[PDB]
């Protein structure tokens, strides 16, 4: 139940950096939905790269390759 482990007032603080005055309660769960979609895409293709490398231990270079291919390239991790 760690999709609930990202807590509701933490999502409210994501509206604090997000700049929201009035927060509908449905936004939390749909945010967990898009979150679930985004994450399961990333680990899905990432574990596809992992199974090509004949591995059992997931490295960060997987999500380097995926987030490169997902157009959200991240730095500072090689």
């Amino acid at each position: 139940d760690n999709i609930q482990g990202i807590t509701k007032p933490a999502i409210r603080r994501l509206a604090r950096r997000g700049g929201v005055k009035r927060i509908s309660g449905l936004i939390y769960e749909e945010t967990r939905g898009v979150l679930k979609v985004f994450l399961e895409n990333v680990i899905r293709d990432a574990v596809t790269y992992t199974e090509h490398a004949k591995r059992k231990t997931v490295t960060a270079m997987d999500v380097v390759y995926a987030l490169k291919r997902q157009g959200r390239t991240l730095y500072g991790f090689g």
């Binding site: 596809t48 790269y49 199974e51 090509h52 390759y65 291919r69």
Partner: protein, 89 residues
């Protein structure tokens, strides 16, 4: 030009249906498009595990990267079994 194989498989599937030259160029540019999608992704994929030889496991892995779910299972099915029938010769 890709009129040969698209048009012949078209004669294998839809016998009573016509085609324009415009859509035939759409077929040519389409196979060029996704062809270079796969060649690019696999070309990145071989270096990722320090390999320099473009074999089929990289390709089928790339299919597992690209196609979502159902038609990926169908493409792995008919394509992988097509490779198996290729190995039967």
């Amino acid at each position: 030009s890709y009129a040969i194989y698209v048009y012949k498989v078209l004669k294998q599937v839809h016998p009573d249906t016509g085609i324009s030259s415009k859509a035939m160029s759409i077929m040519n540019s389409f196979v060029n498009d996704v062809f270079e999608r796969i060649a690019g992704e696999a070309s990145r994929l071989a270096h990722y595990n320090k390999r320099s030889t473009i074999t089929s496991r990289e390709i089928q892995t790339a299919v597992r990267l690209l196609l979502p779910g159902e038609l990926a299972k169908h493409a792995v099915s008919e394509g992988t079994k097509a490779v198996t029938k290729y190995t039967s010769a």
